[PDB]
Every structure is written in C-alpha cells, then in structure tokens.
Design a protein around this ligand. Sequence first.
Ligand code: TC7
Ligand code: TC7
Ligand code: SF4
Ligand code: SF4
Ligand code: SF4
Ligand code: SF4
Lengths: 449, 420
Amino acid sequence: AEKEKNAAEIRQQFAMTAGSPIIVNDKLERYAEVRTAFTHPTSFFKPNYKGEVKPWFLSAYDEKVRQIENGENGPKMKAKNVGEARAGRALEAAGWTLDINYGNIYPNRFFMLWSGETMTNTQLWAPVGLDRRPPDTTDPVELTNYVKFAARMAGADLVGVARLNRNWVYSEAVTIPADVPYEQSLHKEIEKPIVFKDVPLPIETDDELIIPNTCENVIVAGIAMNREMMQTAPNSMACATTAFCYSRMCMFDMWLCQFIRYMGYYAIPSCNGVGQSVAFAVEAGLGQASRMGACITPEFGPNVRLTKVFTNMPLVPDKPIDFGVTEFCETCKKCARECPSKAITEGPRTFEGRSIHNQSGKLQWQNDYNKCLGYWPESGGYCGVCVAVCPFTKGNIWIHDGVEWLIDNTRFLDPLMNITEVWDGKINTYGLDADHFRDTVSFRKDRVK
Amino acid sequence: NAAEIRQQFAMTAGSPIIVNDKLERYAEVRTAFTHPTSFFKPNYKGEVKPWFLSAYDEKVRQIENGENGPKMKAKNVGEARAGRALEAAGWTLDINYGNIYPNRFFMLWSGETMTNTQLWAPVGLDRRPPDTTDPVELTNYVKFAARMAGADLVGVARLNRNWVYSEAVTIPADVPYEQSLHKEIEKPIVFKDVPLPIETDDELIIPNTCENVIVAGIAMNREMMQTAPNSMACATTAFCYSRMCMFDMWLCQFIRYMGYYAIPSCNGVGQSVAFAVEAGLGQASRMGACITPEFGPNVRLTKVFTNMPLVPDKPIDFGVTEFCETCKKCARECPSKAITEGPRTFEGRSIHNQSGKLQWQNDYNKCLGYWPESGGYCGVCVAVCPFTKNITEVWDGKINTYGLDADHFRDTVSFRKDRV
Ligand SMILES: Oc1cc(Cl)c(Cl)cc1Cl
Ligand SMILES: Oc1cc(Cl)c(Cl)cc1Cl
Ligand code: SF4
Ligand code: SF4
Ligand code: SF4
Ligand code: SF4
C-alpha cells in the first residue's frame, strides 16, 4: 500500500554532514548590491512596446496598461474580457501593499528597521521592558525551538538556521539617505557599505551600515507561493502570488525581529536586501541551488520565496540537505529550454560569472540576468516560467519504494508521455493548499535535534 | 465537508438579529476598554492605572516569578519570558490594541497616500472606472482576494447602520503616535451624499452609496487558546490582530484597484459580531461571540465597507441558540462571573451593552477587571466552549504556518460554487 508522504522523513534521509555546501575559489569577493540587474545602470533601462527607453519597471507598467485595454492577461494571452484582465492586475498591485519599491531592499528604512526602538509596537510595550531586559535563555537548543515556533506563527512555511557566511552579505547596499521622504526615494538611491565591527548593536552612521561582529547566525524562512497561480507564468496571476508573498515576507521579518528583540537579543530584517537569500537558504538546509539559480526545496521546489533575519541569538545550525537536485539539473534543462529570453545556460557549472550581475568565485550555473530582466517589460510581469516548468514545482514528485524516499524520474521526461479557471478554482488561506499543508507540520523533534 | 454543512444550514434572507423600537447606534467610547468608568484598574500593588498598564505590571511580576499566568508556574523564567515575548511581538502590525482609530495609521479610508499606491500610480488602477459591475463576478473576485489576504472565512452582507458606531474613538490627525493614548477623542460617524469616504474636522463621513460590508474570519490556534488565561492564549490573539490589519489593507487596495472605494476597520467603526452574523459566518452565542461551524468562537473578526456591487450571503442557523440555551459552560467557567446564565433580553446590563437587540447580556466591566489580575486577555470562555473543539507541551508540540492546523485546513478550501 501507499506510504503516506512524510516530509520530515525525507529531510532526515537527505541530511548532509555539517559544512557550507557552496564550493568557492580564490576570486570570490563580496558583491555590491548595485550590480543586480534591477539596479545596475547597464540593465536598469529597457524599451517599452513603443520603443521608448525607460526604467524597466515603467516600461513594464506601459505593457500592463496595454494588456488591460486589450483584454489580455499576459503577452498575446487573451483574457475572458477586460474586467478579468483588470482584476488580475488589481490583485497583483494589491499584493505589494506591505513592500517598499519591489523588495524592501533599503536597510534600516521603512519596514526594515535595524532597531525596534522607534516602532509603534515597541513604544506601546515599553513599560514591560522586554527589549531592555537581559536574556533569560542562553541555551541555543531551547532558543532554536522558541525561535522556530515563532517563525511558523509569523508565516514561514519553512525555517532553517545557519552560521552567517559573510561572503553572501552585500559589500555595499542600495539605500536612500535618512532624510529623503518616500516620494523621492526612487530618484535618490545611493550605495552604502555594509561593514562588520566590534560594536554592541547594529547601527547606521552617515558613512556605513555596521553589523556587530557578534552577529553569528542567520534565520532563513521559506514563504510558499501558490501552485495554480504560478503555473500561469508569465501571465498576471503568477505576478499576484509573487506580490502577496513579498508582503508576507515583510510581516515575517518584522514579527520575528520583534520576538528576538523581546527575548533580549538584536535582530536585523532584510527581505530582498542585505545579502543573497539563495546562498543563505542552501547553507541553512532549506534546499539546494539549481540550474535556474533558485533554491529548490523538497516541499515546494523553487516555487517558494525567501527572506532572512540576522541575529546574535545563540542557535543550533541546521544541516544542509542533498536530495539529488544537482544531478537532476545536470540532465533536465527544462527551464533553459522554456525560458522566453534564453537567459538560463544549458552548459556546466563554472566559477566564472557570465556578466557583472553574477558573483564570480562560487560554483554555480551562470545565467544572463540582463536577458531575464529584458523579458519583464515585454511580458508586463515578473515572468516565472522557469519556476512554473520545473518538475520540482509539481506537488507530485516523491515516492517511497518500501525502503526509502526517491524522486520519480517520470516527471522529468521531456516531452511528458487558463486564468478564468484559476479565478473560479481552488483556493485557501494565503493561497496555501490543504492537500499538501501537512508537509509543513512541525514538532520539537524537527525544530531542534 | 464544510461547504455541504454551510449550505445545509442556510437561512432565508433577512437579518436574524431581533431588534425593538428602542435600538439606537452605540457610541464606541462606551466599550469597557475606553469608558471612564472601566478604564482605570488597580495593579497587584494597589496602584490605580490605565487597565493595560496594570496588566503590564502583572506580566513583569509573572516573568520575575517564573509564571505563565496567574498561579501558573512556568517551566522556568526563560519559558515565562518567551511567552510574553511572543505575545508582544504578535501585535507588531496593530495600533494601541485593535486599530480602532478610523483613517489613522494602517486604517486609512483612502489609498492615495500609501506607498504602494504611489509606486503603482502610473498604471492608474485606482483612477480607472470599474471594468466589472456584475455583482456575481465581483463577489467571486473579492472572495478569492480575501483568501489570498489571509481570511479563513469570508462573507458579504448589506451594511446595517445599526451596528456602526454612532461616534468613533480616534485622535486628531496631526497628533503623533507617542501622544495618541493621551489625546483620544470622540468623533461622529455619519452618512451623507458624497462621492468618496472623507473625514472633516468635525465628522467621519461614509457615503450613502456604501452598500456592503465584507466580513473576514481569522482563525486562532486551538492548542494556544486552550492555555487561557495564560500567555500563549495572549500570543495567538495578538498574532491574529496583525493578520487582521494585513487583511484589511490588502483587500482595501484590491477593491480600490478594481475602481471602487473601501473602508478598513479591524476593531473600529462598528460591531464585528453583528456584521459576522448578518454575513453568515456564524451565530451569536451566550458568551457574546460569533460562533462559526469551522472554529466555534476561536476565530477573530475584521471587516471592510465598500460600494462594490456584491451578492449578500445567507445567514446560517446550525442550532447555536438552542445549544447555548442549555449549555452555560462558559458562564460557569468564567473567572469573573461576567457571562449570564439567564435568558436573552433587549435591555443591557450596563453602559457597555447596546440595548434594543435580543442577546445574552453580559457584564463586560467584570470581564475587563480580570485582565489586569491575570496579566492577559483571558479567553477562558472561548477555550471551554464545545464548539471550539501545559504551555511547555505547546512550545514543544504541533505547529504549522500562521498557527493553522493541517488536520482541519481542508474545511476552508473554496471553489467558485461556494463563493457565489
Ligand atoms: O524581486 C522583484 C523585484 C522587482 Cl523590482 C520586481 Cl518589480 C519584482 C520582483 Cl519579483
Ligand atoms: O481586543 C483587545 C483590546 C485590547 Cl485594549 C487588548 Cl490589550 C487586547 C485585546 Cl484582545
Ligand atoms: S527545470 Fe530542470 S534543470 Fe531547471 S531548475 Fe528545475 S530540475 Fe533543474
Ligand atoms: S523568470 Fe522567465 S525570463 Fe527569467 S530566467 Fe526564468 S524563464 Fe527565463
Ligand atoms: S474573557 Fe474570561 S473573564 Fe471575559 S467573559 Fe470570557 S471567561 Fe469571562
Ligand atoms: S460554552 Fe456553551 S453556552 Fe457558552 S457560548 Fe459555548 S455553547 Fe454557548
């Protein structure tokens, strides 16, 4: 008979021995955040459908407007009618409500404060003194159980702990000056170094963002996206599950940082800022790096967002996981074949970046992320076709042979041997799926060993 | 199958709340949280303070004494601290315990100044007339969005103005957060022939076109609520308040980007239990909460008011009134004897009740008096209610995302057939 799926068993079977799995060489340097395709001058500008050269997201806006006017949900994808086209973009736009300028990347601004002292919640609770009282727990075993329980309350579907590897922290962040109001933010972005110094608390000066040398650990959260909506990539409903999860990321960071602070430690939120989430996620054991470049998890494949929190709270690092992703990506190449911009390489992993957007000196599949971003104004969205077509995104993949768990190779056969229906179809709270939600149930035994 | 149950128990259309000719709209300042007769309570040292500051003093005393609640020893001081840290953190996205000030902080009545609206302005979704006016399609769209936005239950009713507060508790618009608690004022909520929700110096003005209310249920965690009146029940309460706030903002933005207006509220603007009953989420109960089939009373409520055309849901009758008539378990377990064992009447027991509607009349000042004593938000009534069915074992035990339970999460799956 069918053995019922056991995500905890799977993770136990594929756990590695301790050690960062990412292979590096001597040309590795920390990466300036301005180099990402979203921010770098070489990639920031893209034509719209009229050939006008604009900040890429404004050219994408032009395409969203054009699609609604033409009753489309995506490029050359007719909607049922204009109202359906409208509704998909309204859902997408609303999803971003708790996120600043697509990703919350500016450290210590708006929602990403490095201290809780000015927050309305901290002020309201100040008489209790939780943020000023020294820790009552220093045992990393108990702290790991407490903080992972809090992480699940705060909306994480996956949570893991790693020692902080500074190689993945940006050398300089993209931010804005502290006196710049929101309306000017996109016009006044600057770079600012992230440095590690012997100070008691995270602090920002006029010149530097300063992380204490005591900042030992990073807590990584996975925020699951909705399968039915992502499968509409590159059309509007994939944009909406992306957007809603960014606001879930923001709430997670703020909730968890406040818990850590109220336990007597400090905590730095980040969302898409501060450092490279995929590397932290790999080192914390959420999953493995992949050909497309995302972290692939056993529960969700790559169809999961990441955020992370940095802290001096003593914790027990989790073990990395190896469930064969590298070997499957070596032979699969579905994302590379389906990518509308041919951004994903079909070749082997190297240590040499394809362009300025890649960090050289770590072994990975090297993709052209200017090509990727170039497709976003064209399609009017955040694409996601690679996530949608990846076999690991199917809910389907795990089988038990009577002895152990394995991946069903039939899902990788190539070839295998609409948005109205999404709006009319299955949904549940936060877009989670009750057919698989058991996979992320947690007891103490799987929070800390 | 929960969708079958809810259809089995649908009533004919029509508000099930029985009223008489005495009913009048209720001033929000009359709640026990705010009213001058109930606001000040002694702490354990005998010092009279705002009730929540006296409750703070009890939380500190409990942590120092390694306790999770009144007369409830924790495993150690570390565990006691962790429960209060979790509770305090849960409130991160909530202003002064409930977001009641309308059109302040997170509860803005227009989206125009929000950072998300400004970023999206070149698309013009909030300026573009609606492309959809069909209430059937809009009901399906907005309910799908409500589930994305974190509602475990969602219902629609016509707006009954009887449950809208006659006057809100708020603060002047330019008062900074740090002075808010000391500068709360009353302000009338009125309905007028105006295009958009608007606030003047003198009035909060809701348009006469504001036809509908969308009510969301936000499920609390059963294991944590069963620790009431101890700290982990406080924590699931607190986290759900921040889920409420996110829900309101997300859904208001969706409705605005569809071409309509939307008023968020959380614990402000009007009486959530009455809206929830009229929208079919559940039935009124002896303790005074809305009892749902999926969660009993262990669910929080929030609501959004809009002119978006929608199809009202039917109220539901699955026998709560007859069950509460003979049960009385909440009344017997209540640590303050706040809940009556008598029959329902139209006359309130005190200023905190709205007279003129048939309900079990409870003494809510007695309830609030137990909160500084116990250092929390009690919830024993919710915990012991049959419809709802130590702290170290909770921290070491089962949990899942947002505190939801995969053993029951299938009950809130939704398809178009059950949305409209
Ligand atoms: O990570 C992202 C960054 C930006 Cl700038 C956009 Cl528009 C969308 C996504 Cl998903
Ligand atoms: O509704 C509430 C209001 C207040 Cl003021 C507190 Cl402290 C707690 C709860 Cl649950
Ligand atoms: S589609 Fe195939 S090659 Fe691409 S990331 Fe997924 S498994 Fe790897
Ligand atoms: S998001 Fe789209 S364009 Fe970018 S790599 Fe994936 S498939 Fe290619
Ligand atoms: S919250 Fe506690 S004190 Fe208040 S009515 Fe319920 S049982 Fe009684
Ligand atoms: S405990 Fe009994 S009387 Fe009280 S609300 Fe629940 S069912 Fe009704």
